[PDB]
Design a binder for these strands. Structure first.
Ligand SMILES: [Zn+2]
Lengths: 52, 114, 71, 108, 24, 177, 130
RNA sequence: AUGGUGAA
RNA sequence: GUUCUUUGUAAAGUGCCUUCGAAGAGUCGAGUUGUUUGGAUGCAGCUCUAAGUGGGUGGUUCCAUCUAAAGCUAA
RNA sequence: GUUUGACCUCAAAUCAGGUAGGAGUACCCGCUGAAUAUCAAUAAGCGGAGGAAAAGAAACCAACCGGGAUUGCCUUAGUAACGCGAGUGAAGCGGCAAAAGCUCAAAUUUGAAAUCUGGUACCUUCGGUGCCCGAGUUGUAAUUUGGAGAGGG
């Protein structure tokens, strides 16, 4: 039961990974390669009114 | 099927005993044959005995009405450990000094904004 | 050498020693040892009928209430 | 060998206990006002930290009694002496601010 | 306390001297 | 109060008066059973300062223990085993000689309604106090356990076995430090 | 364990108790004003801030008056026994306002009350009656 | 080594 | 919130003045013998056995801190 | 009094009201305990409790411009220290979780043992009242537990 289960990750590296993931969403080609059917989105990144 | 307890509640001790004797005689007569009626009479016997026991227990409770130290049979069956673990009054008992201190400085309700 | 024991009936009641090696009869305490883990399991509570212990949990859930339903 | 798999469970239980205390102790802030303390062990004397409870002298200088102060949420420690005017003044000011900010409902 | 000293003196006179004290 | 006089008199243990009293009392007890019910304590000041009160519910027992598991602990265990329905609160020394040492133990009956309704003594009625001497919770038991504050009891401040378990365990968090 | 298997096999049935959800939900039970304004959707600290109250007096670890007016407004929401009154009247008639003379009355001042207590009681009686 | 079993 | 009761020259608190002002002995302690500690401490058989402006714990003339030998108490 | 009473002590009753064994046992407390240093206050054994147990509000930690119940975690720290050899191995301070203080002995209620257990009849029955019985004076209630506290104005 005392086998390692959780992996310690530097907070700075965690923030770097999150920032890179957020940035990757700005490229339609990269998003298309992810398998999402974003071929018909009017704009990327997709911005909608707060009323949603 | 069989006798109804709600009908037997109001029957007297002698009537209940007579009914029990009749049911026992019927069961003995049926045993010679060896037949769902046997089950019905057996259930009726148990119902009559239970009604008689219930009447006797309430009579015993009535004769011991209100007086201290009733028979242990009628006493609570909760558990051995709950007869100990001093009752609410004993636990709530507090010395006069502590009561005076509480009255003089009771715990107040307050909030900290202004 | 051994005979039926009233307390347990394990047929381990020594005739000459007049004692049961399994349950410890006639000793008040029931013979048991930590090293006998299998022996403890064979005689641990719950192996029998548990005529009374079964209903304790149910009675506690109701707060050991008494009386009858008000209909 | 003990593994703290319950760490998240322990935190959740502590949060639930705090919420229950708040529900029972809604009006009050769940905490007793503590005094400022200067530590021994010069390696740490520069650091000021909260203490157990205010001294009797500080409570008296604050215009209230220890018995009454406790019922209002002020921690009282009769074991600590006073040997610094600055700390005493800071504790008195903190107690005065607490008294000026607390609201007490009537017992009627 | 004067009362405590008086009680101690009274006890001293009542109890006399201990066997080891008597050696003096 | 007179109890101060009693304490002062008892301070001079080797006084010829206390010697006579002790040698008379030991001889008197030598003709009685090892454990027997005592009508009243022979050291009222000690019992009173130990929490004993002259009211229905308290019991005084005198027990004889062979000289040479302390003697007081043995006496407490014996009285608790014999007085299964009573709780041992405290005990004090009352006599000694070349062959035997005598101690007096005061017991409180939790079944008596007087104790149950006594706000200052109903605490002993809790089941957690059963057989205090058995777990060494009495004054003598705690003293023998080394329970105290300071460097002199660091290794036995609270639990000699507990510290060994604590220093033998391997604490591992979800995220290794 | 053996007992668990026996219970599972027994026809008595388990005494099921479902209370996991009730651990998260706690209803305020110490104030009527807070209950009306308290929102269970927010946390303890968030609810205290919304009400305008402090949930911690000491510097909390880790990173972080429209309602108090009602609490402030909430803040704005003994006699003498007949025998005591008769005793006071007797002394007042016998000595009037002469407190010093009243103090030495051996057969009316049964309890040797001080001049201050006597005058305070007499003033209370006069205010209550005349 | 600890605790038990039967065996004159 | 709602309703009946209080009372009795009853019980407490605040500031001042005044007169007083108790403290766990076969116990602490030393000796020795068994025992534990990586601590030299503590535990334990027994000879003796301490004082009340007294006693315990620590250092360069002593200065710093408490009042043991009783007990209860949720987190 | 060639008697009759106060107690104290000791026995008995198919006396009335009560409790004790044992079971379970992962955790708790105590005793004991192997295979001069090491496996070790482990394994096994015995006794005693609960949902937690123990401990707990210092004859404490420190030598500082001092901290102030107990308990658990990180840190202190694999350091001080020891057996200086293989090896064992702390604790204050610091941060965190949770915080609550109290009760007797001790000095006269003596202008009123004011205290309490039990029996009896009721009621609003985890208890209350009128009466009786007994315990208590070799001390049951209130007033004080060093933060002092007590009689008075
Ligand atoms: Zn058997």
């Amino acid at each position: 039961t005392w086998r390692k289960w959780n992996v310690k990750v530097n907070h700075n590296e965690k923030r770097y990974a999150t920032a890179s993931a957020i940035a990757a969403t700005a490229v339609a080609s990269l998003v298309l390669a992810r398998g999402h059917r974003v071929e018909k989105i009017p704009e990327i990144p997709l911005v909608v009114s707060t009323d949603l | 099927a069989g006798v109804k307890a709600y009908e037997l509640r109001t029957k007297s001790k002698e009537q209940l005993a007579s009914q029990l004797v009749d049911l026992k005689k019927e069961l003995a007569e049926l045993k010679v044959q060896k037949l769902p009626k046997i089950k019905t009479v057996r259930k009726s016997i148990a119902c009559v005995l239970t009604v008689i026991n219930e009447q006797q227990r309430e009579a015993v409770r009535q004769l011991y009405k209100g007086k201290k130290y009733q028979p242990k049979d009628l006493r609570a069956k909760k558990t051995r450990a709950l007869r100990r673990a001093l009752t609410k009054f004993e636990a709530s008992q507090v010395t006069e000094k502590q009561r005076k201190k509480q009255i003089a400085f009771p715990q107040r309700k307050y909030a900290i904004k202004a | 050498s051994h005979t039926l024991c009233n307390r347990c009936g394990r047929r381990s009641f020594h005739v000459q020693k007049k004692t049961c090696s399994s349950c410890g009869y006639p000793a008040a305490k029931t013979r048991s040892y930590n090293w006998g883990a299998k022996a403890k399991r064979r005689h641990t509570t719950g192996t029998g009928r548990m005529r009374y212990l079964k209903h304790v949990s149910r009675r506690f859930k109701n707060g050991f209430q008494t009386g009858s339903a008000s209909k | 060998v003990k593994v703290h798999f319950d760490q998240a469970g322990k935190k959740v239980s502590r949060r639930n206990a705090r919420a229950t205390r708040a529900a029972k102790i809604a009006p009050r802030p769940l905490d007793l006002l503590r005094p400022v303390v200067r530590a021994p062990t010069v390696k740490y004397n520069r650091k000021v930290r909260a203490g157990r409870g205010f001294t009797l002298a500080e409570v008296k200088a604050a215009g209230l009694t220890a018995a009454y102060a406790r019922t209002i949420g002020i921690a009282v420690d009769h074991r600590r002496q006073n040997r610094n005017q600055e700390i005493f003044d800071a504790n008195v000011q903190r107690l005065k601010e607490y008294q000026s900010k607390i609201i007490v409902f009537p017992r009627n | 306390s004067n009362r405590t000293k008086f009680v101690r003196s009274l006890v001293r006179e009542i109890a006399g001297l201990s066997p080891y004290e008597r050696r003096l | 109060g007179a109890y101060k006089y009693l304490e002062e008199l008892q301070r001079k243990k080797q006084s010829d008066v206390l010697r006579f009293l002790q040698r008379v009392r030991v001889w008197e007890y030598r003709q009685k059973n090892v454990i027997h019910r005592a009508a009243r304590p022979t050291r009222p000041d000690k019992a009173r300062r130990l929490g004993y009160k002259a009211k229905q519910g308290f019991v005084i027992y005198r027990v004889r223990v062979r000289r040479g598991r302390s003697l007081r602990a043995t006496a407490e265990e014996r009285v608790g085993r014999r007085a299964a329905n009573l709780r041992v609160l405290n005990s004090y020394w009352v006599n000694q000689d070349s062959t035997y040492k005598y101690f007096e133990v005061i017991l409180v009956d939790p079944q008596h309604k007087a104790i149950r309704r006594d706000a200052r003594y109903n605490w002993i009625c809790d089941p957690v106090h059963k057989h205090r001497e058995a777990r060494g919770l009495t004054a003598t038991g705690k003293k023998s356990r080394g329970i105290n504050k300071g460097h002199k009891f660091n290794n036995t401040k609270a639990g000699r076995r507990k510290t060994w378990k604590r220093q033998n365990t391997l604490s591992l968090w979800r995220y290794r430090k | 364990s053996v007992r668990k298997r026996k219970m599972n096999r027994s026809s008595v049935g388990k005494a099921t108790r479902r209370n996991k959800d009730k651990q998260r939900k706690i209803n305020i039970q110490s104030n009527p004003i807070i209950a009306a304004n308290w929102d269970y959707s927010l946390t303890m600290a968030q609810n205290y801030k919304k009400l305008g109250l402090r949930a911690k007096l000491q510097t909390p670890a880790g990173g972080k008056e429209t309602e108090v007016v009602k609490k402030l407004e909430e803040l704005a929401s003994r006699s003498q026994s007949e025998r005591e009154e008769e005793w006071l009247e007797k002394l007042y008639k016998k000595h009037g306002d002469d407190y010093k003379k009243m103090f030495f009355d051996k057969k009316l001042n049964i309890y040797q009350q001080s001049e201050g207590d006597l005058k305070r009681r007499l003033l209370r009686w006069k205010k209550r009656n005349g």
